[PDB]
Structure 1
Amino acid sequence: MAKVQVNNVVVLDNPSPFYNPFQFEITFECIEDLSEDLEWKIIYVGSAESEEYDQVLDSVLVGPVPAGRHMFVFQADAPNPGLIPDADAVGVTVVLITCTYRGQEFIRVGYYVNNEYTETELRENPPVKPDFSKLQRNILASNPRVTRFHINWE
């Protein structure tokens, strides 16, 4: 059906400090030489309230993509705290990995991210202003939400 199929996503350096870059080791396979590059994005949801707080941590092209099975590490910078609503800073949100071909998204892998203080003192009494230097990010890598879209591969 679709020329590209994602075989697996391994979440590296997890858990880790909120400031560390996201590191995904992706494995996907191409059923037939693509004429263009694949475009991958890592999107962090600052708040579920509005998409207006989505942060595209990074956008990269992968290519060339000859038919076969392939693997690469998609690394991106940690979101900018200054753009994250205080109330959504500590707790759970989501981070998305999407892939698009010829301007059309065909796959999207969402993960829940849990940002908590490891320091029991702070966990008991969280500061009004979230302290991201002391936050730990735990990508819940066991339960990935995979959504596939039907696009025109030409």
Structure 2
Amino acid sequence: MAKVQVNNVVVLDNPSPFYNPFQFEITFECIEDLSEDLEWKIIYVGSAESEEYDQVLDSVLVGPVPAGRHMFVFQADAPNPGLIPDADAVGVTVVLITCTYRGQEFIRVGYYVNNEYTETELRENPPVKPDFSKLQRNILASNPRVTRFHINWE
């Protein structure tokens, strides 16, 4: 039905320190050769309440993509802590992977991410200002939230 079918996304290097780059091994199948490019993005949700704090970590144009199976590791630098509101830094946030074809988003894969301290004192008495050098990022990889939108593939 859809020219591009995403078969699987594997979260690599997880858990890891907050500052480590994100690494996702994506596998997708192309039913027919694609005339245009696929644009992949990784978006970090800095704040659940405000859109302005979403950070596009990386965007990649892959194309043209011939028919068959494609597998690639999408890597993106960790978010800029200078744009993460303090109240949202520690605890659960979301990381999204999106793909568009001809500007139309056809898949959105989201993971809940748990940012937490690893030292007992910090876990019991967290600092007023979040210490990103002491946070451990744990992408909850066992439960991805997926949405597939039916777009125009011509």
State the Cα RMSD in Å: 0.6
Structure 1 residue 150 displacement after superposition: 1.1
CA deviations over 1:99-136 (Å, ceiling 9, x no partner)? 00000100000000000001111111100000000000
Residue aligning to 2:122: 122
Q: Give 1:24 deviation, angstroms.
A: 0.3
C-alpha separation in 1, matches of 2:119 and 2:61? 39
Q: Please give the alpha-carbon distance, in whole angstroms, between the structure 2 residues aligned to 1:7 and 1:62.
A: 17
> How much has 1:62 moved relative to structure 2?
1.3
The residue aligned with 1:74 is: 74
Distance 2:124 2:42 in 1: 32
Percent of counterpart pairs with the same letter?
Answer: 100
Deviation for aligned residue 1:64:
2.7
- Displaced runs of 4 or more, over 4 A: none
Please report the TM-score for the alignment, with normalisation by the length of structure 1.
Answer: 0.99
Alignment length, in residue pairs? 154
User: Matches of 1:69 and 1:63 in 2, distance apart?
Assistant: 14
Q: TM-score, normalised by structure 2?
A: 0.99
Counterpart Cα distance in 2 of 1:134 and 1:64? 42
Report how far residue 63 of structure 1 moved. Answer: 2.3
Aligned to 1:20, what secondary structure does the other structure show? coil
* Deviation digits for residues 57-89 of structure 1 (CA, Å, limit 9, x no counterpart): 010011231000110000001000010000000
Cα offsets for 1:25-66 (capped at 9, x unmatched):
000000000001110000000001111110000100112310
SS of aligned partner of 2:33? coil
Structure 1 unaligned spans of 5+: none
